[model samples]
Target: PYSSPPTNLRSLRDRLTQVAERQGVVFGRLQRHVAMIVVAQFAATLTDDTGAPLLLVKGGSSLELRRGIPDSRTSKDFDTVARRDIELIHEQLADAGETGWEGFTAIFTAPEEIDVPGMPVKPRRFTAKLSYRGRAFATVPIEVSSVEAGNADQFDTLTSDALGLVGVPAAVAVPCMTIPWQIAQKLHAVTAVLEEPKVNDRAHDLVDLQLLEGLLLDADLMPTRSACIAIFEARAQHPWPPRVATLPHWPLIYAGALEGLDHLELARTVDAAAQAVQRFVARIDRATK
Candidate 1:
């Protein structure tokens, strides 16, 4: 069974709900807090087991924490970029009942690693599910990606403010990509469809590329012509994008993020993303020579 946060650490629900109100979503009492610890500790455990820093975060969860999209944008799994040899995860900790992992009930495996044509990585992912009273409540996935040259440095440790609720309790020391890398990766994840096979997927990611690049104006990761091109040039080698309607339940999936943006705000954001993508394509097209 599950228990509440400590008495001294009171107002857990109250504080989180207030944050949710601003970001426009709500989370379960335990699900909201413990999930962050689960992911952060899980990463630390993987590093200890593998004896190398196998991964750093990417995807919605990282975006939320790092960028202050803090939009209650928790992910079903933590996405990461890992060394190719990360496939040996089974060998490192073959023991299912390992120590240091406290919150989970049953740890499951994907059975087989999957591949994506344009994604460059083998699309290796780890999935762990937690249960309450023998009933599954939440599952966390760690998305492990492959790296291209010049792309590794874009990732580093998260700042103090970015940790949100998990900051102290878990002392959740995060290692993840910066906004520029995320924007570049985001562009590829949803848009690189020219040579790759088509699929219905990850519409949220594409839209985020727009909002982040077009709207947030990330002080450091700002997508300048040169910066955006840098990411594009690197990805042009292993390059990638996602379709809109193919996104599962847009109204449901995106409503939270899109809550306040008016028609013009939405339109300009879309237009900016389109222009940025064109620039990337041109850069990539030229790279072919």
Candidate 2:
């Protein structure tokens, strides 16, 4: 069984308020916290009737978990790749809500299928409404999709900065995609099918690219040519080696993405991400030839 301290409303609220002030977001303190708990708790029960992992953590939620909430960009939605039947998975989550955490009950709603660009299948989406005692305080969006598997994922853990406030100390380990794999996916998302109306909010992908590269790539992991090529070819339908110049709305997109982080130089940050993509793609091309 997973370990968690009983929920303390006053302590959690006080800490979360401080977190929101630092992030410069008006709200979402509870939302972020609830999503973190939901992901960590659900990951613990990922096995199906056959004992295989039912979900592969990906997208913003995974990144948020890797990087602490106050230090990283906030994500109100949790996303994952589903290996089992979507209906059964949703039912599991609904049941999980009854199991609650820290005295907060998460009431998960029904899933609605929504189509996403570049993805072959429609993903089921829902929300987890978190309440304490009797009042609903926050809600977090959860999305699960059907997609081809990436290269591999390592056993990792997710923890928040505010965990100490509630009394839990250690982070929760999970099955997460590798850094190179996540980077390749973000790069593909930034470049692929810019013509689609649904692709407008992808600027966050760039922000994540910057965070991932700075936090992990520079620190430990480097994207080797073989890994890059394999990841790109795995999702070959999405354009590899993003062409930032082709997109006319990139400035606007980047501006929206950099909204709260007043310290960052948007142009330079975008340029750096672009150059890295070029370098990775160049490496893949040279080695393959």
Candidate 3:
């Protein structure tokens, strides 16, 4: 397995434990330890050439979304976007070889492991005996994307409780996506999968969207229909249908109706995702902006 814990891990562990407890979560020893290693790494890398590292608290089991509710949704993946300059990011992982930046799925002698200095841990983290020498330490459950012009990610400053290490706010960084951006991205994913629904369709994207809608309803945090419509044109350059956004109100038990969801569920989900956009857009209304 991975080597010993970092010297300063106990303090970090206690703080994280406290935060989880406060947020109504209880982590198992393994989950806590492994999760803390990632937390330390994320907190450590708040900035680079890029202004801030935007960690996505999206997906099914986003900490912010499921803190108090344990049985809400389940996801082990962590999604994030490079605040900017992804080129510099890849450079850190590999030297200026013949190719500027390249990746794995190759047979190599030595692979680059995810090097986290402050956390100082290695890739023995996975029980699969997996190593990151040739392979990228990322791309495995942790998804990272770069922000291009017109990409629908309106990132904002958010200090996550898990990343709240003691006295390290000096670096004080960590960005997250805006709600409308998240909705847009999620809807985009489901819609793309809908192209060949007969052969290829992942119902979970829609499931996740509906779950988001349910959570929003429970929190009573619906976006204004008007704001969502404008975003479709502005950032997405997507004049997608607004049928869902104009809903009379929010949906309650959104995702559970279909035990074994199919393509039809995908269509219905794509239909409902726009409403989530409306709700999120309303949250960041002019008053807040």
Candidate 4:
């Protein structure tokens, strides 16, 4: 139910790749191009009965597009939150592909329910096999979950090169999860004990905290304190300033994650990441105090 792109797919892809390189997105050119196009399609097609978008992009992809510098740590999936039926969302995406969207089409597997320990409800996962001009090129993982109504302030608009690259003739604003919420979530993710209470092995979350901080200033930290309290209370069942501890395997994972990032100006040692978190947490605490 989407219109075709204004330009040829290859030209738009070239522009997308060039823009991504300029932005320093730390993913393969083809992969980023394919993912963005698919994401744009998702944003276009997955709407409510009133034609409003049902979901907002979250996690590192939101951070990458919303922030000025973009995230150096790459992401392989689109993490999102919405109030709609998860199965219905999946079906809509699959249907869009079958009917066609902007010379690109995708076929998605049925949603599989996954348990995410701090989320309000279980999330649905799907893999989208996306193709361009009838040639399959990428498989993008998508996860959609539900959030509390209290977190609605955490949603905002994302304006970027996505619409242009996807060949949408008019600019379409996509919804995005705010930075404060993402930082608060990453705080818990970084400090989580591996497989103890919940499974948390994403070391890139730590390095991303470093970049996410640079995107906000002292004033932003004030609101982030509230976000920290709400999210930490809901997800971690704890208060802010979570106990900062480094497990034996964290450094190993952090090292590898840092090694994989692009446009890193300096060595992001595990200790450095830990210290940065501490500094940011202290500021958040101080700002509210």
Model 4: how far residue 284 lies from native, Å: 1.2
Q: Report the lDDT of model 4 for residue 73.
A: 57
TM-score of each: 0.62, 0.76, 0.45, 0.79
lDDT of 3 by residue, 71-150 (tens): 33344555554543434433332232212111112111233344321111222111111122233222224444544333
Q: Which structure among the candidates has the greatest TM-score?
A: 4
All candidates' lDDT scores?
A: 0.50, 0.61, 0.38, 0.68
lDDT of 1 by residue, 217-283 (tens): 5344323334445655655644332222223343444444454344424423334434555554354
Candidate 4 least-lDDT 10 residues: 1-10
User: Quick one: how many clashes does candidate 1 have?
Assistant: 6
Better of 1 and 4 by TM-score: 4
Which of the two candidates, 1 or 2, achieves a greater TM-score against the reference?
2
Evaluated at residue 267, the lDDT of candidate 3 is 28
Model 3, position 90: C-alpha lDDT score: 38
> lDDT tens string, model 4, 170-215?
4545687677877777887777655566656776777778777877
lDDT by residue (69-177, candidate 2, tens digit) is 5445666677777766788878777676677654556777888988555456678988877766446666777888774554343434454545444445545556666
